[PDB]
Amino acid sequence: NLKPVDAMQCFDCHTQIEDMHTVGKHATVNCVHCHDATEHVETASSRRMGERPVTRMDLEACATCHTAQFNSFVEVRHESHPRLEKATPTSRSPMFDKLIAGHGFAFEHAEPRSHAFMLVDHFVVDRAYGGRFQFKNWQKVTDGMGAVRGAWTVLTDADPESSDQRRFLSQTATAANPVCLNCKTQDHILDWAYMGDEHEAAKWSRTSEVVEFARDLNHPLNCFMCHDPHSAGPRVVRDGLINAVVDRGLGTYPHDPVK
Amino acid sequence: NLKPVDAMQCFDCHTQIEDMHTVGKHATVNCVHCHDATEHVETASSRRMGERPVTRMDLEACATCHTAQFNSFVEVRHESHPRLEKATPTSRSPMFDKLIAGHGFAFEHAEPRSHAFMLVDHFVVDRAYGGRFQFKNWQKVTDGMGAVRGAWTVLTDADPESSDQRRFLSQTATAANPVCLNCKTQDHILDWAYMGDEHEAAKWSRTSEVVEFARDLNHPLNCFMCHDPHSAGPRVVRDGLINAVVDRGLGTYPHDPVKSEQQGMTKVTFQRGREDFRAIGLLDTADSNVMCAQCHVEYNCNPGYQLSDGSRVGMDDRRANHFFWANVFDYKEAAQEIDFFDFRHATTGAALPKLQHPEAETFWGSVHERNGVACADCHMPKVQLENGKVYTSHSQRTPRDMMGQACLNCHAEWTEDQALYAIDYIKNYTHGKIVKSEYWLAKMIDLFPVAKRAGVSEDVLNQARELHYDAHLYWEWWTAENSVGFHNPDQARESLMTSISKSKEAVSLLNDAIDAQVA
Amino acid sequence: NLKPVDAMQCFDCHTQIEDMHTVGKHATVNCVHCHDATEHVETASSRRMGERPVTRMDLEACATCHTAQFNSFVEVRHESHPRLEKATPTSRSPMFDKLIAGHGFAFEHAEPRSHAFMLVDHFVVDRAYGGRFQFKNWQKVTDGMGAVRGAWTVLTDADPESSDQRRFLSQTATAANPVCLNCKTQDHILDWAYMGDEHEAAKWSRTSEVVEFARDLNHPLNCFMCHDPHSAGPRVVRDGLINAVVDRGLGTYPHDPVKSEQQGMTKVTFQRGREDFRAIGLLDTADSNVMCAQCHVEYNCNPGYQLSDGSRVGMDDRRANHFFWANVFDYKEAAQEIDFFDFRHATTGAALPKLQHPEAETFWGSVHERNGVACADCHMPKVQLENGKVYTSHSQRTPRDMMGQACLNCHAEWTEDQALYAIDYIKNYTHGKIVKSEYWLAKMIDLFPVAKRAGVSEDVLNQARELHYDAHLYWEWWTAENSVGFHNPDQARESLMTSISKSKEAVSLLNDAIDAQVA
Ligand code: HEC
Ligand code: HEC
Ligand code: HEC
Ligand code: HEC
Ligand code: HEC
Ligand code: HEC
Ligand code: HEC
Ligand code: HEC
Ligand code: HEC
Ligand code: HEC
Ligand code: HEC
Ligand code: HEC
Ligand code: HEC
Ligand code: HEC
Ligand SMILES: O=S([O-])[O-]
Ligand SMILES: O=S([O-])[O-]
Ligand SMILES: O=S([O-])[O-]
Ligand SMILES: O=S([O-])[O-]
Ligand SMILES: [Ca+2]
Numbered sequence A: 001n002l003k004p005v006d007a008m009q010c011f012d013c014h015t016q017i018e019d020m021h022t023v024g025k026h027a028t029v030n031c032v033h034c035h036d037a038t039e040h041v042e043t044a045s046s047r048r049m050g051e052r053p054v055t056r057m058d059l060e061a062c063a064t065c066h067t068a069q070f071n072s073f074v075e076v077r078h079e080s081h082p083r084l085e086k087a088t089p090t091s092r093s094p095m096f097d098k099l100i101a102g103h104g105f106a107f108e109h110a111e112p113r114s115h116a117f118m119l120v121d122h123f124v125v126d127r128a129y130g131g132r133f134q135f136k137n138w139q140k141v142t143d144g145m146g147a148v149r150g151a152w153t154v155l156t157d158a159d160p161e162s163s164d165q166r167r168f169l170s171q172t173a174t175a176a177n178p179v180c181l182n183c184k185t186q187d188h189i190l191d192w193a194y195m196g197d198e199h200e201a202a203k204w205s206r207t208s209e210v211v212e213f214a215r216d217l218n219h220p221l222n223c224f225m226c227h228d229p230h231s232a233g234p235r236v237v238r239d240g241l242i243n244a245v246v247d248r249g250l251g252t253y254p255h256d257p258v259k
Numbered sequence B, C: 001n002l003k004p005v006d007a008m009q010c011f012d013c014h015t016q017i018e019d020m021h022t023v024g025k026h027a028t029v030n031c032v033h034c035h036d037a038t039e040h041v042e043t044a045s046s047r048r049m050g051e052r053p054v055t056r057m058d059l060e061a062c063a064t065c066h067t068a069q070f071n072s073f074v075e076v077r078h079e080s081h082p083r084l085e086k087a088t089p090t091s092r093s094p095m096f097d098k099l100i101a102g103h104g105f106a107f108e109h110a111e112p113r114s115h116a117f118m119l120v121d122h123f124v125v126d127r128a129y130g131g132r133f134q135f136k137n138w139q140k141v142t143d144g145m146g147a148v149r150g151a152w153t154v155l156t157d158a159d160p161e162s163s164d165q166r167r168f169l170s171q172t173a174t175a176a177n178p179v180c181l182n183c184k185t186q187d188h189i190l191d192w193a194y195m196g197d198e199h200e201a202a203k204w205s206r207t208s209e210v211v212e213f214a215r216d217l218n219h220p221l222n223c224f225m226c227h228d229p230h231s232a233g234p235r236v237v238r239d240g241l242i243n244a245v246v247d248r249g250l251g252t253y254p255h256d257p258v259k260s261e262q263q264g265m266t267k268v269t270f271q272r273g274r275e276d277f278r279a280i281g282l283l284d285t286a287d288s289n290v291m292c293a294q295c296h297v298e299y300n301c302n303p304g305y306q307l308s309d310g311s312r313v314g315m316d317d318r319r320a321n322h323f324f325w326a327n328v329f330d331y332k333e334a335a336q337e338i339d340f341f342d343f344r345h346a347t348t349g350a351a352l353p354k355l356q357h358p359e360a361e362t363f364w365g366s367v368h369e370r371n372g373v374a375c376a377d378c379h380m381p382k383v384q385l386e387n388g389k390v391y392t393s394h395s396q397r398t399p400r401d402m403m404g405q406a407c408l409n410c411h412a413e414w415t416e417d418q419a420l421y422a423i424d425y426i427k428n429y430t431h432g433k434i435v436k437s438e439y440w441l442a443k444m445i446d447l448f449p450v451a452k453r454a455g456v457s458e459d460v461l462n463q464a465r466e467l468h469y470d471a472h473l474y475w476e477w478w479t480a481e482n483s484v485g486f487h488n489p490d491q492a493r494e495s496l497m498t499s500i501s502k503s504k505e506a507v508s509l510l511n512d513a514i515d516a517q518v519a
């Protein structure tokens, strides 16, 4: 069973977290729900991390107290046709191939389906990784809950021994890069510097080998993308959005300064 | 927003809570979710309460983190007919009035409906409070969530100025007493000593003014009735059940010492002033059979009379709060064991028992119980989801509404229609024997005034009255029990055949005696 | 094809019609739609009819221009069980035969079905005409449109050669008389003097041979019963209702003088030979409460007896056509006011009233009536159309079939299931008290022969008979009334509790008296 940690000890070093946590609607929610900090706390100073604490990024971290939101999130809408190519006469763009010729989307561009699949679908689409990643079998395409538990529980890698982008199937492309992942998962939220700029503290950046990066990522659309886990208040985490809205001064509603 | 309190401070005085809280699945759940103890902490001493902390007993205290269980619990099953009188030709007991004459249930006995309404229905039923309490208007009868938020949000009191039980409408009774409430709410869990015995720490007891007690109570079927709020482990809190299982050493399965040992109960006592005050029964397993047995049992919760001498047994007597914890065929011996009966029949003068919804005692020994099946398997099954986190449905209702999750989950050889047909075979057959038992009971009852008026001897009338006790018991168990035989079809059949046998014997006895007086 | 007549010619003699016709919403509707007056116009004088014009009374006279109202009116609700006897354990009054013994309704009293059938059902029911009239075959029972086209298109007469009321089948009665027909048809509207009093201009009256009268009548619930054909304004035509509201000055809402004034009735009289002959009541507003009260009321439409001396009150007496226009708690006083009762109970010998479908008098004072709600809001709501011209549904039926247009149109906080559940709460509760009132009534009734045979005194039997009157009234109102309490749940509850109180008092009285005779 989970044993709570003394959050007051954390707060002696983590003052920005204290200011958020103590005031919001997660003031009673202990750190141990999402952080394994035993070795960290034994070795840190306020100026030196010491051992890196482990942070849970899976959606079931929130599902224990917020089952209703989690269960509605992971539902698969079966009526949202899966793997349906847009460049067909009965879909969105009957002449897409002629019009887009020269772009990687010609290799495959399907209609979106339920959010549970976003990361797996990113990994398997013909335009992304040269066909490197596939569902373990054709049955796994139905498993939204499985995808949510982790992409690598439902996918295989054609060559675990290499990390370069290349074609494993003839009519595929290798368009994926580390920026794509920011709109599929935020598992890397502590390992990616703002905008994906190079940074001493970042494991991953815009110039990483996307295949290696992919292997570190598991969960789609993390609940903390819209909800700060410390304050429980509404937020965004996506760097490009903050950059447009704040850094470039465009505002949340560029056409409406009052709003 | 809630601010967490320092639980270490509490634990310095509350070692039983520390031992439970730090070790279970609520170890990270702060006391402030359920307790406002600011003034308490400022004034308590090592073993005196000082200022009383405020304890939340509303179910939304748990709904905070367990929305799915809460929302399934509060669902109203509109198909469960509301306020439907059982003494009607289309309900459970067509001849109930004749057979129960003398008892307060003659004033009204409706079929059960959804659990959300249990406390308000207790308050408003015609037999309970003289019609004192009513819904604020006739629209409120639909409002399950409202009733859950609190009885007094949806009800009115005809006279806030008085506290005595009395009749405000002519055809009502005042049967309610404080024991009733234990099977409707546990809002009083900190204000009621074990068994309702007098106790200097208890605001309320068996002898309290029930109208005053009623006004203090709000919520139905509190989530903590089955789940310890500190350890989150399975438990019961009902005094009468702990008394039968533990104090009387009968076991959770009285017919099965092994199962009783494997699926047992540990009584945990809390003290006030270092004197025993209240108790809970922690369960070895999350055994719904025992959890639901907190209420779905035959019981005393009322005054009565002694079988030996007919003297009154009042609310002050321990027997006014009693779980017999006996099947239909051990019941007469259990009632003799405490020297108790409920009422004298208004027509026959027989001393008779009053039977209450004995689902737990009926389910014992059934093929299902013997195979390790429990109430929740049929009435609170796990939800099946194409994609999602599984949880237990808390909408306690007929398995007819969820046959795939209930019956068919174990009976793979049946379609839904076949499983429903199996249920109906048993219920139809049992109901036919209920109706025939009533026919014979009524035929016997109607001969009593004829016998008395023909001058048949008291000795013969008393023999017939002895037969009436048994004819009544072996019938009433089954109009009281809610499954119409399904929970134990062989037992229902044998009991109801015994009722008919007893009535037939009495009919012959009386007819012969009458005919002799005439000739 | 129809050719219009010169209405100016008619108006020269018919000034009352000119005043109504030229001003209302039928100012452009030519007389030829409803009147063939060629020979009349050739022979009439200023104040003698001469040849009688032919007046169309069939509903298709209106369907010509009002197809939607006509087609909704004639719809048969197949879910309204046809020819379903109320004295059965699964209908309204399980103990009806015991309780009504002595009255002609013992021969047959079915639940109401769709309005299309009212006249044919009146003609064929076992209690009415000795079984004289029958459907032509058993297939005709489905034919609502056929019945609307005319009763005699779908029925036969066992003996066209005789005109006396008599029994053609053994277990029938001959309760029908000419007053009945006023609540089944108004085909006789020009042939029946106000109240059915003798009148030299009337073909038919209270004292007519009903079999001969029956043969002259064809159509159910004529459209003009609620709508004046000349002005198209709202009205009533029923004599008994105009008598209560206007002649007796009771008002359309007898408990509310203001509402009575705002929603009142103006009596308009038509003469023959310059003597008053017939009357209508023009309504200030299109108030369905008063329109439906032409028939859905408690009434006398039959011979009876005087309470004072037991003497016969025959069809010749004004009291044989009477609207009490009184709620259940004012009824006994209203019956004493005219010194009248219906029958003597066959077992108890009590003088008793017979109660008829008192929906109007029950609805008074309910939360709905007090809030300005009227029968049509629930039973004839406006049609809701995605695209179209709105009209009023004339399919008078339970709101269960049109919950969106009825209940939910005002109760936006409820789903359909919740609103149905609210209805069922009241109906279930009320039906339980009906059944219990019957139980107590039957227990009392069965003691009468025992008391008489034990030699209990006439004085005690007469006290019990007085109690029987009240026990009967406070029960029978509710098996007569069609909503099972829904129209006024608090009143149903108080009345039925009073019935039980009265029966209980009588049971105790008789049991004690019997026991004293034995000892
Ligand atoms: C139980 C130990 C929790 C864990 C794990 C998570 N949350 Fe939570 N959350 C919890 C509580 C007791 C509350 C307060 C409820 C109230 O209304 O009083 C919350 C609240 C939220 C909210 C709403 C906050 C607001 O300002 O409106 C959100 C959006 C929320 N919680 C999100 C959330 C996330 C994303 C979690 C996983 C990272 C998570 N919670 C875990 C209890 C618990
Ligand atoms: C029994 C005779 C089967 C019938 C009828 C259907 N399926 Fe099947 N399928 C069956 C087996 C034994 C397997 C292999 C299972 C394993 O994991 O070893 C499968 C596999 C599939 C797959 C995956 C195929 C792949 O190349 O990965 C799919 C998508 C699938 N099955 C679907 C499916 C459908 C839709 C069926 C009705 C049209 C169907 N199966 C019938 C056995 C049997
Ligand atoms: C945020 C600004 C995004 C970036 C960066 C990437 N994607 Fe995306 N993706 C995004 C949305 C809002 C959607 C759903 C709406 C839609 O029109 O599809 C998607 C969907 C996909 C899918 C599934 C559908 C499809 O196009 O076949 C795939 C396979 C996918 N995205 C792949 C992908 C790649 C390879 C990216 C980097 C080159 C990439 N996405 C970035 C939002 C965003
Ligand atoms: C010693 C100085 C105490 C401190 C610190 C806390 N509590 Fe207490 N509490 C104390 C006593 C002596 C009693 C009477 C029971 C007993 O153990 O002798 C209590 C009682 C309670 C209760 C029950 C109240 C009721 O209505 O019956 C609760 C719910 C409770 N206490 C809670 C509580 C909390 C949450 C504390 C930390 C904030 C806390 N107590 C500290 C003594 C002492
Ligand atoms: C959030 C601050 C919670 C409050 C308020 C309540 N509960 Fe809880 N509960 C919470 C957590 C984080 C967990 C652990 C989940 C897991 O499986 O790890 C639980 C667990 C339970 C359980 C399951 C217990 C078991 O032994 O498996 C139960 C039955 C339970 N909780 C009940 C419960 C009750 C009755 C509450 C109101 C008194 C209540 N919880 C509040 C979080 C929170
Ligand atoms: C637990 C041992 C109980 C005691 C003590 C009381 N009741 Fe009860 N009650 C209990 C159950 C399990 C049920 C549902 C099953 C059933 O057969 O009804 C009920 C139901 C009611 C109801 C609703 C149905 C009805 O009978 O009208 C009412 C109104 C009610 N109970 C009232 C009531 C009174 C007045 C009590 C003290 C005399 C009482 N209950 C005690 C379980 C238990
Ligand atoms: C006894 C009549 C119960 C009441 C009152 C409540 N719950 Fe319950 N709960 C009950 C059972 C039989 C079970 C299944 C036990 C098993 O292991 O099979 C549960 C389970 C839970 C859980 C655990 C997670 C799950 O399986 O859903 C939780 C968190 C829970 N219950 C919460 C809960 C709430 C919030 C309640 C009040 C609305 C509540 N329970 C009451 C039995 C009973
Ligand atoms: C006392 C606190 C109870 C507990 C514990 C359990 N039940 Fe119950 N139940 C109780 C009452 C007072 C009522 C009637 C409520 C009313 O307002 O009339 C009931 C009712 C039921 C029903 C009928 C529901 C319906 O749709 O008609 C069922 C199926 C039922 N109870 C089952 C049940 C189960 C399986 C329980 C253990 C999980 C359980 N109940 C506990 C009182 C109490
Ligand atoms: C066509 C030649 C008609 C015949 C035959 C009948 N009615 Fe009529 N009706 C007709 C017209 C043109 C109108 C006016 C429509 C408008 O709203 O302007 C009406 C109106 C009515 C009304 C509404 C009256 C009101 O005060 O709002 C009613 C109730 C009505 N008509 C009834 C009615 C009856 C009962 C008929 C058979 C006796 C009948 N109409 C025949 C046209 C025609
Ligand atoms: C052909 C093989 C038929 C079957 C199948 C059904 N019916 Fe019939 N029915 C049939 C005939 C030739 C007749 C006589 C028609 C006539 O007017 O001469 C009937 C009659 C009836 C009746 C009237 C009975 C009577 O008046 O005594 C009814 C009520 C009736 N039919 C109903 C009916 C039902 C409900 C059927 C299915 C159960 C049915 N019929 C079948 C021919 C045939
Ligand atoms: C208006 C004051 C009426 C008088 C006069 C008569 N009836 Fe009636 N009847 C009336 C209504 C509003 C209803 C439907 C509501 C109900 O409770 O039935 C009826 C119904 C009938 C029926 C059908 C149902 C049944 O009772 O079998 C029949 C056969 C019937 N009425 C016959 C009848 C007789 C014989 C009358 C004179 C003795 C008589 N009705 C008068 C309203 C009124
Ligand atoms: C009393 C029992 C009625 C009978 C008989 C008929 N109608 Fe009616 N009508 C009635 C009411 C309560 C209303 C609604 C009044 C309001 O203003 O709310 C109506 C309305 C009409 C209208 C007006 C247009 C409309 O709203 O639909 C017409 C044209 C009409 N009724 C025609 C009509 C016909 C053709 C009838 C015989 C089939 C008929 N009405 C009978 C009440 C009553
Ligand atoms: C006398 C001419 C009546 C008028 C005016 C109204 N009603 Fe009536 N109603 C009457 C009878 C004789 C019957 C029974 C007909 C039969 O053949 O059995 C009825 C019946 C009803 C019903 C029941 C319909 C069903 O589906 O079972 C309803 C709902 C009803 N009546 C309502 C009603 C309303 C609202 C009226 C004013 C608009 C109204 N009726 C007038 C006799 C007469
Ligand atoms: C508007 C024309 C309404 C129609 C149609 C229905 N109802 Fe109604 N109802 C209406 C009002 C204005 C009120 C009073 C609201 C208040 O709180 O002041 C009501 C009341 C009720 C009640 C309560 C009755 C009581 O307490 O005595 C009930 C049970 C009710 N309404 C139910 C109901 C049903 C089932 C309806 C369709 C058959 C229905 N109402 C229609 C307004 C209107
Ligand atoms: O805390 S007191 O008991 O010394
Ligand atoms: O009265 S309760 O026990 O059903
Ligand atoms: O028309 S006559 O009366 O002169
Ligand atoms: O007989 S009629 O009044 O129902
Ligand atoms: Ca889609």
Ligand SMILES: [Ca+2]
Residues within 6 Å of the ligand: B080, B081, B111, B112, B113, B114
């Ligand atoms: Ca039920």
Ligand SMILES: [Ca+2]
Residues within 6 Å of the ligand: B298, B299, B300, B301, B354, B355, B356
């Ligand atoms: Ca009992």
Ligand SMILES: [Ca+2]
Residues within 6 Å of the ligand: C080, C081, C111, C112, C113, C114
């Ligand atoms: Ca009907």
Ligand SMILES: [Ca+2]
Residues within 6 Å of the ligand: C298, C299, C300, C301, C354, C355, C356
């Ligand atoms: Ca009458």
Ligand code: NA
Residues within 6 Å of the ligand: A079, A080, A081
């Ligand atoms: Na789609």
Ligand code: NA
Residues within 6 Å of the ligand: A090, A091
């Ligand atoms: Na398409």
Ligand code: NA
Residues within 6 Å of the ligand: B079, B080, B081
């Ligand atoms: Na039911």
Ligand code: NA
Residues within 6 Å of the ligand: B090, B091
């Ligand atoms: Na039934």
Ligand code: NA
Residues within 6 Å of the ligand: B446, C446
């Ligand atoms: Na009898």
Ligand code: NA
Residues within 6 Å of the ligand: C079, C080, C081
């Ligand atoms: Na019906």
Ligand code: NA
Residues within 6 Å of the ligand: C090, C091
């Ligand atoms: Na019925």
